[PDB]
Design a protein around this ligand. Structure first.
Ligand SMILES: [Mg+2]
Ligand SMILES: [Mg+2]
Ligand SMILES: [Mg+2]
Ligand SMILES: [Mg+2]
Ligand SMILES: [Mg+2]
Ligand SMILES: [Mg+2]
Ligand SMILES: [Mg+2]
Ligand SMILES: [Mg+2]
Ligand SMILES: [Mg+2]
Ligand SMILES: [Mg+2]
Ligand SMILES: [Mg+2]
Ligand SMILES: [Mg+2]
Ligand SMILES: [Mg+2]
Ligand SMILES: [Mg+2]
Ligand SMILES: [Mg+2]
Ligand SMILES: [Mg+2]
Ligand SMILES: [Mg+2]
Ligand SMILES: [Mg+2]
Ligand SMILES: [Mg+2]
Ligand SMILES: [Mg+2]
Ligand SMILES: [Mg+2]
Ligand SMILES: [Mg+2]
Ligand SMILES: [Mg+2]
Ligand SMILES: [Mg+2]
Ligand SMILES: [Mg+2]
Ligand SMILES: [Mg+2]
Ligand SMILES: [Mg+2]
Ligand SMILES: [Mg+2]
Ligand SMILES: [Mg+2]
Ligand SMILES: [Mg+2]
Ligand SMILES: [Mg+2]
Ligand SMILES: [Mg+2]
Ligand SMILES: [Mg+2]
Ligand SMILES: [Mg+2]
Ligand SMILES: [Mg+2]
Ligand SMILES: [Mg+2]
Ligand SMILES: [Mg+2]
Ligand SMILES: [Mg+2]
Ligand SMILES: [Mg+2]
Ligand SMILES: [Mg+2]
Ligand SMILES: [Mg+2]
Ligand SMILES: [Mg+2]
Ligand SMILES: [Mg+2]
Ligand SMILES: [Mg+2]
Ligand SMILES: [Mg+2]
Ligand SMILES: [Mg+2]
Ligand SMILES: [Mg+2]
Ligand SMILES: [Mg+2]
Ligand SMILES: [Mg+2]
Ligand SMILES: [Mg+2]
Ligand SMILES: [Mg+2]
Ligand SMILES: [Mg+2]
Ligand SMILES: [Mg+2]
Ligand SMILES: [Mg+2]
Ligand SMILES: [Mg+2]
Ligand SMILES: [Mg+2]
Ligand SMILES: [Mg+2]
Ligand SMILES: [Mg+2]
Ligand SMILES: [Mg+2]
Ligand SMILES: [Mg+2]
Ligand SMILES: [Mg+2]
Ligand SMILES: [Mg+2]
Ligand SMILES: [Mg+2]
Ligand SMILES: [Mg+2]
Ligand SMILES: [Mg+2]
Ligand SMILES: [Mg+2]
Ligand SMILES: [Mg+2]
Ligand SMILES: [Mg+2]
Ligand SMILES: [Mg+2]
Ligand SMILES: [Mg+2]
Ligand SMILES: [Mg+2]
Ligand SMILES: [Mg+2]
Ligand SMILES: [Mg+2]
Ligand SMILES: [Mg+2]
Ligand SMILES: [Mg+2]
Ligand SMILES: [Mg+2]
Ligand SMILES: [Mg+2]
Ligand SMILES: [Mg+2]
Ligand SMILES: [Mg+2]
Ligand SMILES: [Mg+2]
Ligand SMILES: [Mg+2]
Ligand SMILES: [Mg+2]
Ligand SMILES: [Mg+2]
Ligand SMILES: [Mg+2]
Ligand SMILES: [Mg+2]
Ligand SMILES: [Mg+2]
Ligand SMILES: [Mg+2]
Ligand SMILES: [Mg+2]
Ligand SMILES: [Mg+2]
Ligand SMILES: [Mg+2]
Ligand SMILES: [Mg+2]
Ligand SMILES: [Mg+2]
Ligand SMILES: [Mg+2]
Ligand SMILES: [Mg+2]
Ligand SMILES: [Mg+2]
Ligand SMILES: [Mg+2]
Ligand SMILES: [Mg+2]
Ligand SMILES: [Mg+2]
Ligand SMILES: [Mg+2]
Ligand SMILES: [Mg+2]
Ligand SMILES: [Mg+2]
Ligand SMILES: [Mg+2]
Ligand SMILES: [Mg+2]
Ligand SMILES: [Mg+2]
Ligand SMILES: [Mg+2]
Ligand SMILES: [Mg+2]
Ligand SMILES: [Mg+2]
Ligand SMILES: [Mg+2]
Ligand SMILES: [Mg+2]
Ligand SMILES: [Mg+2]
Ligand SMILES: [Mg+2]
Ligand SMILES: [Mg+2]
Ligand SMILES: [Mg+2]
Ligand SMILES: [Mg+2]
Ligand SMILES: [Mg+2]
Ligand SMILES: [Mg+2]
Ligand SMILES: [Mg+2]
Ligand SMILES: [Mg+2]
Ligand SMILES: [Mg+2]
Ligand SMILES: [Mg+2]
Ligand SMILES: [Mg+2]
Ligand SMILES: [Mg+2]
Ligand SMILES: [Mg+2]
Ligand SMILES: [Mg+2]
Ligand SMILES: [Mg+2]
Ligand SMILES: [Mg+2]
Ligand SMILES: [Mg+2]
Ligand SMILES: [Mg+2]
Ligand SMILES: [Mg+2]
Ligand SMILES: [Mg+2]
Ligand SMILES: [Mg+2]
Ligand SMILES: [Mg+2]
Ligand SMILES: [Mg+2]
Ligand SMILES: [Mg+2]
Ligand SMILES: [Mg+2]
Ligand SMILES: [Mg+2]
Ligand SMILES: [Mg+2]
Ligand SMILES: [Mg+2]
Ligand SMILES: [Mg+2]
Ligand SMILES: [Mg+2]
Ligand SMILES: [Mg+2]
Ligand SMILES: [Mg+2]
Ligand SMILES: [Mg+2]
Ligand SMILES: [Mg+2]
Ligand SMILES: [Mg+2]
Ligand SMILES: [Mg+2]
Ligand SMILES: [Mg+2]
Ligand SMILES: [Mg+2]
Ligand SMILES: [Mg+2]
Ligand SMILES: [Mg+2]
Ligand SMILES: [Mg+2]
Ligand SMILES: [Mg+2]
Ligand SMILES: [Mg+2]
Ligand SMILES: [Mg+2]
Ligand SMILES: [Mg+2]
Ligand SMILES: [Mg+2]
Ligand SMILES: [Mg+2]
Ligand SMILES: [Mg+2]
Ligand SMILES: [Mg+2]
Ligand SMILES: [Mg+2]
Ligand SMILES: [Mg+2]
Ligand SMILES: [Mg+2]
Ligand SMILES: [Mg+2]
Ligand SMILES: [Mg+2]
Ligand SMILES: [Mg+2]
Ligand SMILES: [Mg+2]
Ligand SMILES: [Mg+2]
Ligand SMILES: [Mg+2]
Ligand SMILES: [Mg+2]
Ligand SMILES: [Mg+2]
Ligand SMILES: [Mg+2]
Ligand SMILES: [Mg+2]
Ligand SMILES: [Mg+2]
Ligand SMILES: [Mg+2]
Ligand SMILES: [Mg+2]
Ligand SMILES: [Mg+2]
Ligand SMILES: [Mg+2]
Ligand SMILES: [Mg+2]
Ligand SMILES: [Mg+2]
Ligand SMILES: [Mg+2]
Ligand SMILES: [Mg+2]
Ligand SMILES: [Mg+2]
Ligand SMILES: [Mg+2]
Ligand SMILES: [Mg+2]
Ligand SMILES: [Mg+2]
Ligand SMILES: [Mg+2]
Ligand SMILES: [Mg+2]
Ligand SMILES: [Mg+2]
Ligand SMILES: [Mg+2]
Ligand SMILES: [Mg+2]
Ligand SMILES: [Mg+2]
Ligand SMILES: [Mg+2]
Ligand SMILES: [Mg+2]
Ligand SMILES: [Mg+2]
Ligand SMILES: [Mg+2]
Ligand SMILES: [Mg+2]
Ligand SMILES: [Mg+2]
Ligand SMILES: [Mg+2]
Ligand SMILES: [Mg+2]
Ligand SMILES: [Mg+2]
Ligand SMILES: [Mg+2]
Ligand SMILES: [Mg+2]
Ligand SMILES: [Mg+2]
Ligand SMILES: [Mg+2]
Ligand SMILES: [Mg+2]
Ligand SMILES: [Mg+2]
Ligand SMILES: [Mg+2]
Ligand SMILES: [Mg+2]
Ligand SMILES: [Mg+2]
Ligand SMILES: [Mg+2]
Ligand SMILES: [Mg+2]
Ligand SMILES: [Mg+2]
Ligand SMILES: [Mg+2]
Ligand SMILES: [Mg+2]
Ligand SMILES: [Mg+2]
Ligand SMILES: [Mg+2]
Ligand SMILES: [Mg+2]
Ligand SMILES: [Mg+2]
Ligand SMILES: [Mg+2]
Ligand SMILES: [Mg+2]
Ligand SMILES: [Mg+2]
Ligand SMILES: [Mg+2]
Ligand SMILES: [Mg+2]
Ligand SMILES: [Mg+2]
Ligand SMILES: [Mg+2]
Ligand SMILES: [Mg+2]
Ligand SMILES: [Mg+2]
Ligand SMILES: [Mg+2]
Ligand SMILES: [Mg+2]
Ligand SMILES: [Mg+2]
Ligand SMILES: [Mg+2]
Ligand SMILES: [Mg+2]
Ligand SMILES: [Mg+2]
Ligand SMILES: [Mg+2]
Ligand SMILES: [Mg+2]
Ligand SMILES: [Mg+2]
Ligand SMILES: [Mg+2]
Ligand SMILES: [Mg+2]
Ligand SMILES: [Mg+2]
Ligand SMILES: [Mg+2]
Ligand SMILES: [Mg+2]
Ligand SMILES: [Mg+2]
Ligand SMILES: [Mg+2]
Ligand SMILES: [Mg+2]
Lengths: 146, 97
RNA sequence: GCCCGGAUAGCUCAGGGUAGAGCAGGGGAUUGAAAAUCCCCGUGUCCUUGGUUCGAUUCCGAGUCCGGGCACCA
RNA sequence: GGGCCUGACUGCGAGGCCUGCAAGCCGAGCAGGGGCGAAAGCCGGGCCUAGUGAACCGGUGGUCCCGUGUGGAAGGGCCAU
RNA sequence: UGGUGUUGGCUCUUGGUCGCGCCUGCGUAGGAUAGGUGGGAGCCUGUGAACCCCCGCCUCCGGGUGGGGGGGAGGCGCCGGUGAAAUACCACCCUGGCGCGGCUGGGGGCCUAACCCUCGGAUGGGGGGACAGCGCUUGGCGGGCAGUUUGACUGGGGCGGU
RNA sequence: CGUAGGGUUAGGCGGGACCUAAGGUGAAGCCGAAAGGCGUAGCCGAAGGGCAGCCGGUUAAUAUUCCGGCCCUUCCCGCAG
RNA sequence: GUAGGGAAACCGAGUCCGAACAGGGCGCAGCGGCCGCAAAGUCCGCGGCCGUGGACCCGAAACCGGGCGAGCUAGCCCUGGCCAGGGUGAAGCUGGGGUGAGACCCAGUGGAGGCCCGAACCGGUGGGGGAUGCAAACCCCUCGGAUGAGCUGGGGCUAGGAGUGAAAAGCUAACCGAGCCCGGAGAUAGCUGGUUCUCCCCGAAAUGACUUUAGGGUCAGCCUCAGGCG
RNA sequence: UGGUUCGUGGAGCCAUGGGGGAAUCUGGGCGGACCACCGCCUAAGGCUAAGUACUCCGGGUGACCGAUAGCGCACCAGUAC
RNA sequence: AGCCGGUAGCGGGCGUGGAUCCCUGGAUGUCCGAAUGGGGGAACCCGGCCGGCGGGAACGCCGGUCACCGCGCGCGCGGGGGGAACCUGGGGAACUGAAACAUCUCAGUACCCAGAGGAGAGGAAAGAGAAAUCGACUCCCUGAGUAGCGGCGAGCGA
């Protein structure tokens, strides 16, 4: 009796998988405990629907990512600070690079998704990895200046 | 045993035919009937307890049509059944037949 | 009528290259006998018949004979 | 008693005996292929009268007659047992 | 009372078939533990050889072999001696033994959720538990019950006889 | 016996508007081809529980029933505590 | 009906068995002078007899279905009621004796018991009577039980292959080895009985064979009618 | 196992109590085991007059009865008993 | 043109201003009965609610309403019971016949039960069955005592 697992189960399968079990195991255990639902034609389609939407709403987040990748790697964010030869008096932070990115180029960004351990204290050119989406990193060249 | 609530399978009358001798197709003289008496064949009726709409419903059903019960449960989700007695829930399932 | 056993010494039983074993039988040791015991000895187409092998009790085919087993009977 | 042999035939059968029926009995002669005999001829078991069992059901060997739209098959029939 | 349905999870141990893999096979004559035929003058070894240490082993107790730590130019064949049957390496197969794998099947152990019992409380707890009960089917016991049969001749019937 | 007329009077007697017994019936629930069979509560069910009337007089015919004397019960409403 | 033979394929005045042109089985063909009469056959009516039906009529003991019954009787359930009077005198208790303490003994009190006697009540032992009865079980005399496994009123439950039974196959509405009513139903009866106006002609058999047959049947024998032969 | 003429028969077909369990026309059932070929038909949802049966009722008519007959009942009969 | 039932009589009435009487529709219709507010030993007994009658609160009477079940959304609609035969479905004997009896027969009859209606069933091919054909079903004739079925018996029978 084929059923659709609603949870991952020990040596049966992964959630969403369609496995074949003895009718009794399904009626008297799996189905009443919500661990699975019998693989009817009626909800076979329901599985095909949510796989089709999930991978859709996944790849759209990939395209929302590639949109900010094509843009942000294709420019430099320039930060005027006050400094003496090398050392900045204050510091530029993610919050700083944030408010900077909109005011200059009209794009919003998330400080927390940006890779900066210690706040930037030296003048120069930096490359800062950005992740609005795993496996889709955005390199950002940033120029801090006087 | 009585009647399947799903299929309407029902006890039937059959004969119990006692035979002796060797079948002709085995080189025998032939079968002789040494007794015919009436008897009944009952449906393989069983109990099926399912939880529907938060109520417990029991079916007396032939084993053959046991899956037909769980299907009625699936066909039932589109119905508005809460507040109902188990008796009234069962009635709704059986009209989905 | 079909399946499954057999046949090996006097009696009963063991088994691709042996023909065995026990008990019956005979002498010998031994004894109040009657035994128990102990030593030695015999008793084979391994049913027949046909072929396999290099040869065969075996393997096979075939009948003969006795067994067991199941079914049937107008 | 011995020699050669298988007629302890196949296909029929005039005419009778007996007889409630059904059975039972005897049978010359013709054809096929034989045996014995020089031949005439004899041989369809046994000097004779007991040694037996209708039909139904079914087995087996033939026959190739029927074969459920058709060709086959299934299963029957027929001859023999 | 077998099969099967209702009837499920996890283990353990067996049996049988099929496929592959590897080995086993000792009367004698003889190099020794020679399966059957067949191919065959060459196979192997640096893609590790003659002994050594570990053991799966099976031994008919002489031996056979398997994996492993030894181990750094070598072992057996055709040669041939007696063989019915030659010894190397391959190859289909026979008698077995296992190692997996396929499908079957038998036991045992546990589990809980079907089903059963129970708990003043119950979508729950406890116990039994895939047994039991019940359906279909198998064969058996079965005067408890049922339908019947249980001859005729005959110096009456029975008995005897036929 | 035939025809006709007359005769049986209750808050307190008996039964019901009270209670339950066996049993019967039976919302729940269970079972059975049909008919039906069960079944907790509940309901029904008495000669058992419970409950307020004694004596006399009267009629052709009834009387703890009518009458007389002396008693009592329940229900409704009211007043008081 | 007009064609039959063969198990059949099939042939056909023939066909089957067979190797046969053999042999056999079962089959095949009007009176008058083209008119006429007759006829195969077939159709209707009438009569005899047969088959199927209850089949000439009456009659079982029984079998089956569905119902009706425990107001009789049997057991049980619930709830009530009844058992004059007299007799016997268990245990226990008290006192006394007893002994180390006891057992135990005596007296008194006590009132037990499927105890005794005997009415009611329940029975039914022997005899007599009755015998178209007073009575489809009674009457008289006698006799058993009578505090118990007792008797009895009312209310209930259990039934037909079923109940109930201190057990007799007893009882279940006056006949119970399987109740009663209606139904299957006109069961079946190879048995017994019965079978109705007249006259005329003929006129048997009681044997044989076979028969779960023997007092019943089939065939033959023997009777009768019609047509034919002579 | 039932139905049909079909009693296990060569036993199909229709139905179905139990087990196993498809497909959507290039799908499926049938033509008497089975197979090939050739044909027939579209299962697992339902409805549908009329032609047919019967006679409590009414009328019409009898080579139907005529009071022991005809209905059990001609009548105060499903009565009396 | 007579009339007040069978039914006369006593005693009283009606009708050509159309009676009695016949047909149709309507009104009334105690109580019981499917019986249905509840109970019950049918034709009796005891209640709730609203309204009315009495002097009426107790008591009583009158009118309306109040069972259970099914189905649709407390309101509705329907069901229940009967009917001589006839009909369909679910169950289903035995005597008897086989001159015994068991398979077979009687017979899917008798009977029980559910349901139905003036009928009921059946009915528009997953048919038939050999016709290269037919064309729903029902009913009658015939096919035919054929084909077949059968302790190949008795019989059964498309
Ligand atoms: Mg800052
Ligand atoms: Mg059976
Ligand atoms: Mg054969
Ligand atoms: Mg038979
Ligand atoms: Mg038979
Ligand atoms: Mg029968
Ligand atoms: Mg039975
Ligand atoms: Mg279950
Ligand atoms: Mg559940
Ligand atoms: Mg099924
Ligand atoms: Mg199934
Ligand atoms: Mg043989
Ligand atoms: Mg022996
Ligand atoms: Mg011997
Ligand atoms: Mg000689
Ligand atoms: Mg001679
Ligand atoms: Mg010669
Ligand atoms: Mg002759
Ligand atoms: Mg003769
Ligand atoms: Mg003779
Ligand atoms: Mg002769
Ligand atoms: Mg000659
Ligand atoms: Mg010559
Ligand atoms: Mg000559
Ligand atoms: Mg001759
Ligand atoms: Mg014979
Ligand atoms: Mg016979
Ligand atoms: Mg035959
Ligand atoms: Mg043959
Ligand atoms: Mg042919
Ligand atoms: Mg065919
Ligand atoms: Mg054919
Ligand atoms: Mg062909
Ligand atoms: Mg042909
Ligand atoms: Mg043949
Ligand atoms: Mg044959
Ligand atoms: Mg043949
Ligand atoms: Mg013959
Ligand atoms: Mg069983
Ligand atoms: Mg199982
Ligand atoms: Mg366990
Ligand atoms: Mg355990
Ligand atoms: Mg636990
Ligand atoms: Mg549990
Ligand atoms: Mg649990
Ligand atoms: Mg529980
Ligand atoms: Mg539990
Ligand atoms: Mg547990
Ligand atoms: Mg089980
Ligand atoms: Mg089986
Ligand atoms: Mg059995
Ligand atoms: Mg008996
Ligand atoms: Mg017996
Ligand atoms: Mg028994
Ligand atoms: Mg006999
Ligand atoms: Mg006799
Ligand atoms: Mg005699
Ligand atoms: Mg005598
Ligand atoms: Mg005599
Ligand atoms: Mg005499
Ligand atoms: Mg005499
Ligand atoms: Mg005798
Ligand atoms: Mg008087
Ligand atoms: Mg009076
Ligand atoms: Mg008074
Ligand atoms: Mg009142
Ligand atoms: Mg009362
Ligand atoms: Mg009460
Ligand atoms: Mg109810
Ligand atoms: Mg009822
Ligand atoms: Mg009822
Ligand atoms: Mg009841
Ligand atoms: Mg009760
Ligand atoms: Mg009350
Ligand atoms: Mg009552
Ligand atoms: Mg009462
Ligand atoms: Mg009282
Ligand atoms: Mg009391
Ligand atoms: Mg009282
Ligand atoms: Mg009183
Ligand atoms: Mg007083
Ligand atoms: Mg007085
Ligand atoms: Mg008086
Ligand atoms: Mg007074
Ligand atoms: Mg006050
Ligand atoms: Mg013919
Ligand atoms: Mg010929
Ligand atoms: Mg000729
Ligand atoms: Mg001829
Ligand atoms: Mg006559
Ligand atoms: Mg005649
Ligand atoms: Mg009759
Ligand atoms: Mg008749
Ligand atoms: Mg007659
Ligand atoms: Mg009988
Ligand atoms: Mg009998
Ligand atoms: Mg009865
Ligand atoms: Mg009584
Ligand atoms: Mg009484
Ligand atoms: Mg008392
Ligand atoms: Mg007394
Ligand atoms: Mg006294
Ligand atoms: Mg006394
Ligand atoms: Mg005295
Ligand atoms: Mg006394
Ligand atoms: Mg005295
Ligand atoms: Mg005294
Ligand atoms: Mg005392
Ligand atoms: Mg003392
Ligand atoms: Mg004393
Ligand atoms: Mg006393
Ligand atoms: Mg005294
Ligand atoms: Mg006494
Ligand atoms: Mg005395
Ligand atoms: Mg006395
Ligand atoms: Mg008495
Ligand atoms: Mg007496
Ligand atoms: Mg006396
Ligand atoms: Mg007397
Ligand atoms: Mg007398
Ligand atoms: Mg008398
Ligand atoms: Mg007396
Ligand atoms: Mg007296
Ligand atoms: Mg006296
Ligand atoms: Mg006395
Ligand atoms: Mg006395
Ligand atoms: Mg006494
Ligand atoms: Mg006494
Ligand atoms: Mg007394
Ligand atoms: Mg007592
Ligand atoms: Mg009493
Ligand atoms: Mg009493
Ligand atoms: Mg009584
Ligand atoms: Mg009882
Ligand atoms: Mg009873
Ligand atoms: Mg009764
Ligand atoms: Mg009876
Ligand atoms: Mg009866
Ligand atoms: Mg008996
Ligand atoms: Mg009994
Ligand atoms: Mg008694
Ligand atoms: Mg009676
Ligand atoms: Mg009586
Ligand atoms: Mg009696
Ligand atoms: Mg008697
Ligand atoms: Mg008696
Ligand atoms: Mg009887
Ligand atoms: Mg009887
Ligand atoms: Mg009797
Ligand atoms: Mg009686
Ligand atoms: Mg009677
Ligand atoms: Mg009746
Ligand atoms: Mg009747
Ligand atoms: Mg009859
Ligand atoms: Mg009669
Ligand atoms: Mg008889
Ligand atoms: Mg007779
Ligand atoms: Mg008579
Ligand atoms: Mg006479
Ligand atoms: Mg004459
Ligand atoms: Mg004369
Ligand atoms: Mg004679
Ligand atoms: Mg005679
Ligand atoms: Mg005989
Ligand atoms: Mg006899
Ligand atoms: Mg005799
Ligand atoms: Mg006799
Ligand atoms: Mg006789
Ligand atoms: Mg005669
Ligand atoms: Mg004569
Ligand atoms: Mg004559
Ligand atoms: Mg005549
Ligand atoms: Mg004449
Ligand atoms: Mg049939
Ligand atoms: Mg059949
Ligand atoms: Mg049949
Ligand atoms: Mg068939
Ligand atoms: Mg077919
Ligand atoms: Mg089929
Ligand atoms: Mg089928
Ligand atoms: Mg099925
Ligand atoms: Mg197609
Ligand atoms: Mg297809
Ligand atoms: Mg089909
Ligand atoms: Mg067809
Ligand atoms: Mg078709
Ligand atoms: Mg269609
Ligand atoms: Mg259809
Ligand atoms: Mg219709
Ligand atoms: Mg019609
Ligand atoms: Mg009429
Ligand atoms: Mg009339
Ligand atoms: Mg008269
Ligand atoms: Mg009359
Ligand atoms: Mg007269
Ligand atoms: Mg008359
Ligand atoms: Mg009438
Ligand atoms: Mg009348
Ligand atoms: Mg009469
Ligand atoms: Mg009369
Ligand atoms: Mg009368
Ligand atoms: Mg007047
Ligand atoms: Mg006057
Ligand atoms: Mg007058
Ligand atoms: Mg005028
Ligand atoms: Mg007018
Ligand atoms: Mg009117
Ligand atoms: Mg009422
Ligand atoms: Mg009532
Ligand atoms: Mg009021
Ligand atoms: Mg007043
Ligand atoms: Mg008032
Ligand atoms: Mg009132
Ligand atoms: Mg009033
Ligand atoms: Mg009212
Ligand atoms: Mg009714
Ligand atoms: Mg109706
Ligand atoms: Mg009918
Ligand atoms: Mg029917
Ligand atoms: Mg019927
Ligand atoms: Mg029966
Ligand atoms: Mg019978
Ligand atoms: Mg009989
Ligand atoms: Mg008959
Ligand atoms: Mg008979
Ligand atoms: Mg007879
Ligand atoms: Mg008999
Ligand atoms: Mg019979
Ligand atoms: Mg039968
Ligand atoms: Mg009959
Ligand atoms: Mg029948
Ligand atoms: Mg009838
Ligand atoms: Mg009509
Ligand atoms: Mg119609
Ligand atoms: Mg259509
Ligand atoms: Mg048709
Ligand atoms: Mg066409
Ligand atoms: Mg068409
Ligand atoms: Mg014809
Ligand atoms: Mg028949
Ligand atoms: Mg038939
Ligand atoms: Mg038949
Ligand atoms: Mg029949
Ligand atoms: Mg038919």
């Amino acid at each position: 009796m084929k059923v659709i697992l609603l949870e991952p189960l020990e040596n049966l399968g992964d959630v969403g998988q369609v496995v074949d079990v003895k009718p009794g195991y399904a009626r008297n255990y799996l189905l009443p405990r919500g661990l699975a639902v019998l693989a009817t034609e009626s909800n076979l389609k329901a599985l095909e629907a949510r796989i089709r939407a999930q991978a859709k709403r996944l790849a759209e987040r990939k395209a929302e990512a590639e949109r900010l990748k094509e843009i942000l790697e294709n420019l430099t964010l320039t930060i005027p600070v006050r400094a003496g030869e090398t050392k900045i008096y204050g510091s530029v932070t993610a919050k700083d690079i944030a408010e900077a990115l909109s005011r200059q180029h009209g794009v919003t960004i998330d400080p927390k998704r940006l890779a900066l351990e210690k706040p930037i204290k030296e003048l120069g050119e930096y490359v800062l990895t950005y992740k609005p989406h795993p496996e889709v990193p955005i390199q950002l060249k940033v120029s801090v200046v006087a | 045993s009585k009647v399947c609530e799903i299929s309407g399978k029902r006890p039937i009358v059959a004969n119990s035919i006692q035979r002796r001798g060797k079948a002709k197709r085995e080189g025998g003289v032939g079968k002789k009937t040494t007794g015919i008496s009436k008897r009944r064949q009952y449906p393989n009726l069983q109990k099926v307890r399912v939880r529907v709409a938060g109520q417990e419903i029991t079916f007396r059903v032939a084993a053959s049509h046991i899956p037909k019960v769980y299907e009625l449960v699936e066909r039932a989700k589109g119905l508005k059944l809460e507040g109902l007695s188990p008796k009234e829930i069962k009635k709704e399932l059986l009209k989905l037949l």
